[PDB]
């Protein structure tokens, strides 16, 4: 079949990212995978006159799967997959009471890739101890991970899916990278059989779907702030309470504490149980209600980038906020793992959970501010990564002054 | 030359070949050039032609008995395409597997033995000048990889790699390593079989046009390679020479801090903390520097370590990989990687030199990270860890630390110094403890300031400060309250800065004030620090900010 021409953003040259060093086990797995892919035509070996590179990883099931980090190449072909062949995002998918995520990435592998473009998909299987130069391939078919693959394949997808869409004019189906997001309102039992219907339809047409993510987007909002609820109160408690309330002022600018501040006019001791005035309790109730409401002026901007910030809370508990401008939260949430756990395993899942929500709600991913040492994350993130996409990220070095502020 | 396939080469987008002009020089040179270009045209490396080719590149001449031809390609290199980078880092001796026998083969004429893509030869054109520019020049061009062209190393390496393929196939027991113009061949074949295999390899390479040395010229162990000594059963660094001088220059401390880091891969315990401190704000390469007294002690202790040689062993994938860590003091750490308890695979050091305030446990973690990265690079796996810290110490710090941190299998080693949490703040305020409302402040212009406190028991102090900053006074306030209080004290401050430093639980710092605060924090039996917004009339605090 004929290949779609792909051009890079004018004045942009191909990716030149370095390949991280890998466990021997992981290297062997990659060599195995790639020796089979070379055999089926999907990739070929390349010479020194190809200077580009894109990192590759191994993740997992009891089977090793290969994962290409196309983040750099995606930015440099954005005109292609976002304006020329951009796939539109349906704002009705966040409302369904059930969304299932089907991996349809194996479709890309039949379609050839534009000849002039293949050079830009080079990658290297690294060797141990720099003993050998590394094994160097490029793709001859559309790759998973690349954002142009589904843009190019969309038309074929629209045809295969049309029959199913007629019989179920209510089911929402959206494509991001190598996954389909399917949201209905059916009862769970019905929704799961609808999902098997679509799985079988896609299979009677050639698209293989791995199977033997059920997300309920009905509870996805900006969680409300929680002022402590106590029978009795002390100098410290009032002090913590005045402090958090003062911080909240930068986000909900209608809170009042003057009455609560006087409650401790003198220089009382920290453990002094102090009762609350009538002019005092006035605010604790006045401010617990201006705070159960939402903010005003908080609108998503699609020309901007999404920012996600995560904070470690203790005892397998993590909290996050998603914004584009400071103190204007589009979304906030709380991930809680459930002994075989570990700090890095939790941060990793949390990132995956936040990214998936972000795709359902806006159709693009956020850039993470990660509370972890850079080198540690670059070492162990692949160990619990189950997704096929990879968000952008950077590492925070300065801690949060008060962790319980967003608790 | 060789019947190797050429790698196709292109010029950078929207560019054309080099048309630089050839300046004249010695007729003595002009002759000795033509004596090279007929012996090279004969051998097929440079065909002669010049009618229509409009490009050119300069050529000079120099001498070592015989003269040598030279071509400044820098202008053509600026227009040739980007190639796959040739190997950046080089293998580490501690990652090699001992082989029964190892041969080193260096191919001569490497680049000239490899053909150059035809459609790209025209851009290598040069010209031997006439006498007094009264005659036309001798027009030439290359058919092989020119010396010092952007493309020559990477293409050579990939051609060698392809030429080796038919032989690595019939010999899947020999280990060949490539490095620039050399080959390093190893095997556990009995020495009579090996020597035969070596001669087969040479004959193979020779059919492809690559000359090589005979045993009558083949090097023998030990091997002097990239500043190492490679022995049959051990490796070490080539001998290190630390100069003695009485005037030390900035350039010369760099050169010395170099050799010291180099030796640290095998000589355990090298320190470079105080000697590097010297070159902090250094620009002038010649500016002379006084050896600080502490630096001189270090240099002497380094000389002592280098007195006697030490060696490292090679790797045996059959045995486990162990790493041990010790603290050296002053934010300095040292580690050794080994499989057996009397010989190390290698050694090294980690120094924070990043973040004024830090603590022992955070540092240990960063160190383990460093070792984990290096282990993967060298051996392809991570090592079991022997660490001077107790599970309870670590579990306490990582459960409460704001970042995520991961540490692999690790066992405790009870070898002092131990790593400990030296104090901890209370999670809730103390009862029966005086409450100090500290504050502090300075003036930017005057640089004169003050810090004080006011307690619930009615006690009050204010101390005057010269040469200070709002940050320094804010910490000064806390130090006052720790000085003037019992073994249990509640402090209340309006400064996130000071709250930030203390909550980080440092055990050492690059500021003397924080060190005296740490001393008090260890002395006390219960300290609860606590924070309120400033200028909010919270009470207690509204009364202390006024005093200051
Ligand atoms: C028993 C061990 C012994 O004598 N050496 C030097 C280490 C074994 O290492 C090799 C293994 C297989 C091919 C070659 C090997 O040697 C070298 C390996 C490397 Cl990676 C670089 N080399 C450089 C030289 C020189 N000169 C020799 C070697």
UniProtKB/Swiss-Prot annotation, chain B:
Effect of residue 54 to G: 64% loss of polymerase activity. 57% loss of RNase H activity
Site entry: Essential for RT p66/p51 heterodimerization: 397, 410
All residue ranges annotated as the Reverse transcriptase domain in the record: 43-230
Subcellular localization(s) per the UniProt record: Virion
Effect recorded for residue 535 to N: Severely reduced exonuclease activity of RNase H, but no effect on endonucleonuclease activity
Residues the record lists as binding Mg(2+) 2: 439, 474, 494, 545
Ranges of residues in domain RNase H type-1: 430-548
Phenotypic consequence of residue 220 to A: No effect on RNA-dependent DNA polymerase activity. No effect on RNA 5'-end and 3'-end cleavages
Effect of residue 401 to L: No effect on RT p66/p51 heterodimerization
Result when mutating residue 183 to I: 29% loss of DNA-directed DNA polymerase activity. 46% loss of RNA-directed DNA polymerase activity
Record annotation: effect of changing residue 183 to R: 20% loss of DNA-directed DNA polymerase activity. 21% loss of RNA-directed DNA polymerase activity
Residues that coordinate or bind Mg(2+) 1: 106, 181-182
Motif segment (Tryptophan repeat motif): 394-410
Result of changing residue 535 to D: Severely reduced exonuclease activity of RNase H, but no effect on endonucleonuclease activity
Domain of life: Viruses
Catalytic reactions on record: Endohydrolysis of RNA in RNA/DNA hybrids. Three different cleavage modes: 1. sequence-specific internal cleavage of RNA. Human immunodeficiency virus type 1 and Moloney murine leukemia virus enzymes prefer to cleave the RNA strand one nucleotide away from the RNA-DNA junction. 2. RNA 5'-end directed cleavage 13-19 nucleotides from the RNA end. 3. DNA 3'-end directed cleavage 15-20 nucleotides away from the primer terminus; DNA(n) + a 2'-deoxyribonucleoside 5'-triphosphate = DNA(n+1) + diphosphate
Consequence when changing residue 185 to A: 37% increase of DNA-directed DNA polymerase activity. No loss of RNA-directed DNA polymerase activity
Subunit field text: Heterodimer of p66 RT and p51 RT (RT p66/p51). Heterodimerization of RT is essential for DNA polymerase activity. The overall folding of the subdomains is similar in p66 RT and p51 RT but the spatial arrangements of the subdomains are dramatically different.
Protein name: Reverse transcriptase/ribonuclease H
Organism from which the protein derives: Human immunodeficiency virus type 1 group M subtype B (isolate BH10) (HIV-1)
């Amino acid at each position: 079949i004929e290949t779609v021409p792909v051009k890079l953003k004018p004045g942009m040259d191909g990716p030149k990212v370095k390949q991280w060093p890998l466990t021997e086990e992981k290297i062997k797995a990659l060599v195995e995978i790639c020796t089979e892919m070379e055999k089926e035509g999907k990739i070929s070996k390349i010479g020194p006159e190809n200077p580009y590179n894109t990192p590759v990883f191994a993740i997992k099931s009891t089977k090793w799967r290969k994962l290409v980090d196309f983040r750099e190449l995606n930015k440099r072909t954005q005109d292609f997959w976002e304006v020329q062949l951009g796939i539109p995002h349906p704002a009705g998918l966040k409302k369904k009471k059930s969304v299932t995520v089907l991996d349809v990435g194996d479709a890309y592998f039949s379609v050839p890739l534009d000849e002039d473009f293949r050079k830009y998909t080079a990658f290297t299987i690294p060797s141990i101890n720099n003993e050998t130069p590394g094994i160097r391939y490029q793709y001859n078919v559309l790759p998973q991970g690349w954002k142009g693959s589904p843009a190019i394949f969309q038309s074929s997808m629209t045809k295969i899916l049309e029959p199913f869409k007629k019989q179920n004019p209510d089911i929402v189906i959206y494509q991001y990278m190598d996954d389909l997001y399917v949201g209905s309102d059916l009862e769970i039992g019905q929704h799961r059989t609808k999902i098997e219907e679509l799985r079988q339809h896609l299979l009677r047409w050639g698209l293989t779907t791995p199977d033997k993510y059920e997300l309920h987007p009905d509870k996805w909002t900006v969680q409300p702030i929680v002022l402590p609820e106590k029978d009795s109160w002390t100098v410290n408690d009032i002090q913590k309470l005045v402090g958090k309330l003062n911080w909240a002022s930068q986000i909900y600018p209608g809170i009042k504490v003057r009455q609560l501040s006087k409650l401790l006019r003198g220089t009382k001791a920290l453990t002094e149980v102090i009762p609350l005035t009538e002019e005092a309790e006035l605010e604790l109730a006045e401010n617990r209600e201006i705070l159960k409401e939402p903010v005003h002026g908080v609108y998503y901007d699609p020309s901007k980038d999404l920012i996600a910030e995560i904070q470690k809370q203790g005892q397998g508990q993590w909290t996050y906020q998603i914004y584009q401008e400071p103190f204007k939260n589009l979304k906030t949430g709380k991930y809680a793992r459930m002994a075989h756990t570990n700090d890095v395993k939790q941060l990793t899942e949390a990132v995956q959970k936040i990214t998936t929500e972000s795709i359902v709600i806006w159709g693009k991913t956020p850039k993470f501010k990660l509370p972890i040492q850079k080198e540690t994350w670059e070492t162990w993130w692949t160990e619990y990564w189950q997704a096929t996409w990879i968000p952008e990220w950077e590492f925070v070095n300065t801690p949060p002054l008060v962790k319980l502020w967003y608790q | 030359i060789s019947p190797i396939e050429t790698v196709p080469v292109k010029l950078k987008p929207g560019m054309d070949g080099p048309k630089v002009k050839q300046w004249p020089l010695t007729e003595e040179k002009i002759k000795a050039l033509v004596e090279i270009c007929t012996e090279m045209e004969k051998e097929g490396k440079i065909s002669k032609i010049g009618p229509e080719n409009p490009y050119n590149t300069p050529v000079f001449a120099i001498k070592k008995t015989k003269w040598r031809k030279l071509v400044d390609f820098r202008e053509l290199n600026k227009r040739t395409q980007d190639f796959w980078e040739v190997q950046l880092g080089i293998p580490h001796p501690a990652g090699l597997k001992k082989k029964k026998s190892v041969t080193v083969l260096d191919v001569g004429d490497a680049y000239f033995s490899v053909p150059l893509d035809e459609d790209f030869r025209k851009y290598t054109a040069f010209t031997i000048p006439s006498i007094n520019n009264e005659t036309p020049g001798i027009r030439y061009q290359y058919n092989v990889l020119p010396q010092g062209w952007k493309g020559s190393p990477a293409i050579f390496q990939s051609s060698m790699t392809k030429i080796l393929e038919p032989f690595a196939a019939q010999n899947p027991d020999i280990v060949i390593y490539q490095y620039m113009d050399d080959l390093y061949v190893g095997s556990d074949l009995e020495i009579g079989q090996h020597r035969t295999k070596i001669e087969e390899l040479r004959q193979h390479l020779l059919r492809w046009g690559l000359t090589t040395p005979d045993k009558k010229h083949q090097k023998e162990p030990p091997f002097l390679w990239m500043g190492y000594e490679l022995h049959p059963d051990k490796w070490t660094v080539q001998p290190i020479v630390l100069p003695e001088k009485d005037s030390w220059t900035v350039n010369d401390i760099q050169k010395l801090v170099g050799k010291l880091n180099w030796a640290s891969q095998i000589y355990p315990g090298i320190k470079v903390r105080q000697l590097s401190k010297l070159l902090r704000g250094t620009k002038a390469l010649t500016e002379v520097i006084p050896l600080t007294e502490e630096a001189e002690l270090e240099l002497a202790e380094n000389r002592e370590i280098l007195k006697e040689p030490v060696h490292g062993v090679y790797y045996d994938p059959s045995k486990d990989l162990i790493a041990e860590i010790q603290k050296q003091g002053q934010g300095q750490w040292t580690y050794q990687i080994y499989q057996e308890p009397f010989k190390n695979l290698k050694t090294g050091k980690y120094a924070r030199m990043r973040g004024a305030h830090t603590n022992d446990v955070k540092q240990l973690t960063e160190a383990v990270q460093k070792i984990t990265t290096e282990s993967i690079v060298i051996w392809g796996k991570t090592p079991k860890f022997k660490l001077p810290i107790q599970k309870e110490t670590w579990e306490t710090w990582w459960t409460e630390y704001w970042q995520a941190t991961w540490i692999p299998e690790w066992e405790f080693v009870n070898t002092p110094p131990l790593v400990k949490l030296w104090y901890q703040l209370e999670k809730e305020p103390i009862v029966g403890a005086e409450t100090f409302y500290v504050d502090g402040a300075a003036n930017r212009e005057t640089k004169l300031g003050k810090a004080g406190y006011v307690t619930n028991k009615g006690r009050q102090k204010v101390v005057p400060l010269t040469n200070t900053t709002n940050q320094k006074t804010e910490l000064q306030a806390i130090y006052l309250a720790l000085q003037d209080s019992g073994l249990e004290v509640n402090i209340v401050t309006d400064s996130q800065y000071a709250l930030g430093i203390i909550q980080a639980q440092p055990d050492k710092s690059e500021s003397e004030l924080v060190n005296q605060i740490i001393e008090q924090l260890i002395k006390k039996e219960k300290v609860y620090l606590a924070w309120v917004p400033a200028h909010k009339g919270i009470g207690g605090n509204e009364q202390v900010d006024k005093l200051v």
